[model samples]
Target chain A: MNKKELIDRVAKKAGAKKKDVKLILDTILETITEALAKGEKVQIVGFGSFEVVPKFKPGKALKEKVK
Target chain B: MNKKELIDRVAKKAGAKKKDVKLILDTILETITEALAKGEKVQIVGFGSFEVVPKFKPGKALKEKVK
Candidate 1:
């Protein structure tokens, strides 16, 4: 889902105002980007994680996933 | 950093109230998790994307990165 679709779905499910959800989502993305850019990891437990490294060489799993 | 640390930094950087930031963060993570669980992809532009696949075989890139 893209941002707009996510915003709509989340707002409806969370019973939150769309504007507020949008603002918070924007902030969250920006915050995560900043953290990764600094080579930090943003892990969300069962949701997996995000990282920014100098390089990413796809391994067996990634290769198959991409293929 | 853990969730608490992330919340603290985001609150400070976004100039948003901590409680509100936490609430939104929770919602965002939950939403993303739900999407992935449904085998959907969540892409956030420059920030990257998230996906849930039935199988994942780490490739050279992921293997080296993990190493």
Candidate 2:
């Protein structure tokens, strides 16, 4: 699932407005990225040991974006 | 920052309610957990090559859960 698909599920599951949910996710992603870019990590303990690391550069998956 | 802390940031940034923010993220987190648990990956493209892989086992961070 991508952002749009995930937002659909989350909004319906939580009975939230999609616009609000979208904004919330954008905000969350930005927060995590900023934190990681500045050498910090975020750990959310409930989601199967979920966290965002700072050094992700892609291995066997694929390359991302233009520098 | 953890769930609680991230919620604080998101709520303020998105101008959304804490209760609503909490619900949305909980829904998202739950959905992502179930998705990865099944055999799928989640990709949200706006977040600096953001994607969730299913085979995460943690290298040096720490172990998770009580099981």
Shift in Å, residue B21, candidate 1: 1.7
DockQ of each: 0.23, 0.24
TM-score of each model, paired residue for residue: 0.67, 0.71
What is the CAPRI rating of model 2's predicted complex?
acceptable
Per-residue lDDT of candidate 1, residues A36-56 (tens digit)? 566777765434455544222
Per-residue lDDT tens digits for candidate 2, residues A6-61, read 88998888888899889888888777666655555576754422344434323222
Could you tell me how far off, in angstroms, the CA of residue B53 lies in candidate 2 after the best superposition? 8.1
- Cα lDDT tens digits, model 2, B1-67, are 6778889998998888889888888888677666655655667664422334434322232211111
Candidate 2, residue A17: the lDDT equals 84
Q: DockQ for candidate 1, please give it.
A: 0.23
